[PDB]
Backbone:
């Protein structure tokens, strides 16, 4: 009651019919009153000689007064009233509501354009926080309605709050909510959806100085007030799920859970702590009755592991990560596939595990559904070869890969082959050997031997495929004379006898196919001009050409594309092509020029009964059996002894090779030693 | 099931005529 400081303002504030106050006198009076109350000290202040204005500033004539200045100074005064009288809480709840609806007005005007009193409204929000008089809002009968309104205001798109106040706002909403045990769902929608809607790094641009109020706010509420927001977050998930499950719209439920899941994933990237608040439901969802909710749940965790995060998932919630690697044994395949589809991105983005994976993929490469097996090998394609050698190590993975190459199922087998061959070449041009990694290398080295044992099954499509594959990746046509042979030996290094006999057999057919494409052009040139319409051999040469073109088509899967392609070439009867063709099969061609004859020949055939794209894919695989790639000017290189002594695993090949090249045809063999002589 | 090699080391990639 008696203090060292005291209130010095004593001018009337209420305008009556008796004594009236013009607007501008009132504005300056309230300006003074406001300015004075700010400087007071809550403790060493009179407080008694102040009830005069305590009662005055609540007259509905000032609250809902027109001039914005008056309302704004009326507020700033009332802000200090509470502050000073607190904790006694001078006003009744009804007044307090009428007051707190006015403060919601001033906040509303704070994001708008300047009314000339933005400062007065900046004072208001900041002080209501500092002296925490704000939380008086939560002991009212309408607090829920108010709480909603308060939120809708700052989370309103149509308002432009400056970036200075974001800290303050977050504080305001932060305190006021800590006072609630059960927060209305409408609010929580507002807060959380702001993670879904505003994604940063979405548009690439100059500065991204854009920024957003509501976003930065929900960060503040979930980081700082994690402890109290985490209680509420759990209510959101359950309520939302509860709302959509019981929705008449039966198919809503899936759509919202797929949305809830996306909400979670943003949070792990920003405030991973909060995941705890719902990591439960996910665990129960993985074991849900409904395979779709299990599928979606799987997908989710799958994404999580790939995400940058200050925290680490498997550590924090190992409870569930073990349930996740438990889904490689689910009943529903649609679930098993969704698991495997995510692996390639995980491995690329983390090395955390290589144990639960190397335990799991060994079960995935041998599942009963062929869909997953395709998803597994697609790893060896999708993720780079380096990462593979690093992360996956388990023996059983590399064995089961090569094993599917002899599988009945087609779509697997094909992808399997093209995969395990494009792997082998990368696995030599990149990864080097050591005292330890040479452990699994024995398997990577026996790939080319595997591929050759496929000829023995005697299919056309496969024999066409292995043909197309080997010359693509294993034995390329590039880039030099020497490194072809260097790698060619390393290919033959780990061969069994079948691999050799078939390796030698394929090459023994190269000379018998050459004698057939050569005597094809010599028989296909018979329609160049009128030799024998029915003269010299007309009735017997047309039936030796026509019955010889089948001999080369009998080994092609679609022979009804093979005898089709080369009679439209007698229809073209274009000599340029005949020369490039004849030049590839004629044996003993410098390996370099063969490449040039061969490359122009395939590019020329693209875009002139049915499509010539077919003729390009038929000739290409047929040429692989006709022309000399391996038996050529490489002999000169295997001739030059790379090594004087040592490399008994290289010279027994040099023999093995040269030992055969002289036998299949010494038309080419015995001549290079007369030049060397 | 897995497929079986169905030729001999003698007649592999053979072509008559």
Residues:
């Amino acid at each position: 009651k008696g203090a060292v400081t005291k209130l010095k303002f004593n001018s009337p504030i209420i305008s009556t019919s008796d004594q009236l106050i013009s607007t501008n006198e009132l504005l300056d009076r309230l300006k003074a009153l406001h300015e004075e109350l700010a400087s007071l000290d809550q403790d060493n202040t009179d407080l008694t000689g102040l009830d005069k204005y305590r009662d005055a500033l609540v007259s509905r004539k000032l609250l809902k007064h027109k001039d914005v200045g008056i309302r704004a100074f009326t507020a700033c005064c009332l802000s200090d009233i509470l502050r000073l009288y607190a904790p006694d809480a001078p006003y009744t709840d009804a007044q307090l509501t009428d007051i707190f609806k006015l403060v919601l007005s001033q906040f509303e005007q704070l994001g708008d354009q300047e009314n000339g009193y933005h400062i007065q409204q900046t004072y208001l929000i900041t002080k209501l926080l500092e002296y925490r008089s704000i939380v008086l809002l939560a002991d009212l009968p309408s607090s829920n309605n108010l709480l909603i309104e308060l939120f809708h205001i700052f989370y309103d798109p149509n308002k432009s709050f400056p970036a200075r106040l974001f800290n303050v706002i977050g504080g305001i909403l932060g305190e006021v909510i800590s006072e609630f045990d059960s927060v209305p769902l409408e609010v929580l929608r507002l807060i959380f959806n702001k993670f879904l809607t505003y994604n940063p790094n979405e548009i690439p641009e100059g500065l991204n100085v854009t920024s957003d109020c509501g976003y930065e706010v929900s960060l503040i509420l979930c980081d700082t007030y994690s402890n109290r927001m985490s209680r509420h977050l759990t209510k959101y998930y359950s309520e939302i799920i509860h709302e959509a499950t019981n929705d008449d719209n039966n198919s809503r439920l899936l759509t919202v859970v797929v949305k809830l899941h996306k909400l979670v994933l943003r949070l792990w990237e920003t405030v991973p702590e909060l995941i705890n608040a719902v990591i439960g439901f996910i665990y129960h969802e993985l074991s849900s009755e409904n395979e779709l909710f299990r599928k979606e749940a799987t997908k989710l965790i799958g994404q999580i592991l790939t995400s940058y995060s200050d925290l680490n998932f498997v550590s924090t919630h190992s409870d569930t990560f073990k349930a996740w690697i438990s889904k490689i044994a689910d009943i529903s395949p649609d679930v098993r596939v969704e698991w495997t589809e995510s692996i390639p991105q995980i491995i690329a983005t983390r090395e955390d595990i290589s144990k639960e994976l190397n335990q799991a993929l060994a079960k995935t490469f041998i599942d009963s559904d062929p869909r997953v097996r395709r998803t597994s090998v697609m790893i060896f394609n999708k993720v780079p070869v380096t990462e593979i050698w690093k992360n996956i190590t388990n023996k059983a993975i590399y064995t089961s890969l090569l094993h599917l190459a002899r599988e009945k199922h087609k779509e697997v087998r094909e992808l399997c082959i093209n995969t395990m061959a494009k792997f082998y070449s990368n696995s030599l041009n990149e990864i080097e050997r050591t005292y330890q990694n040479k452990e699994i290398w024995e398997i990577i080295d026996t790939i080319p031997s595997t591929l050759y044992n496929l000829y023995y099954i005697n299919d056309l499509n496969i024999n066409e495929q292995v043909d197309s594959v080997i010359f693509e990746y294993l034995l390329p046509f590039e880039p030099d004379n020497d490194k072809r042979v260097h790698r060619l030996l390393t290919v033959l290094s780990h061969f069994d006898k079948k691999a050799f006999t078939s390796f030698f057999a394929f090459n023994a057919r190269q000379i018998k196919i050459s004698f057939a494409i050569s005597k094809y052009i010599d028989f296909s040139k018979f329609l160049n001009n009128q030799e024998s319409m029915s003269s010299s051999q007309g009735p017997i040469v047309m039936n030796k050409y026509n019955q010889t073109l089948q001999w080369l088509a009998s080994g092609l899967s679609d022979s009804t594309k093979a005898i089709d392609a080369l009679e439209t070439i007698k229809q073209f009867n274009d000599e340029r092509i005949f020369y490039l063709l004849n030049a590839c099969v004629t044996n003993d061609i410098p390996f370099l020029t063969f490449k040039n004859c061969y490359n122009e020949l395939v590019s020329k055939l693209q875009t002139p009964s049915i499509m010539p794209r077919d003729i390009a894919k038929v000739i290409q695989i047929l040429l692989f059996r006709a022309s000399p790639i391996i038996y050529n000017v490489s002999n000169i290189s295997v001739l030059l002894n790379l090594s004087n002594n040592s490399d008994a695993k290289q010279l027994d090949l040099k023999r093995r090779i040269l030992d055969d090249i002289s036998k299949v045809n010494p038309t080419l063999f015995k001549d290079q030693i007369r030049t060397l002589k | 099931l897995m497929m079986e090699d169905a030729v001999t080391e003698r007649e592999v990639l053979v072509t008559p005529g």
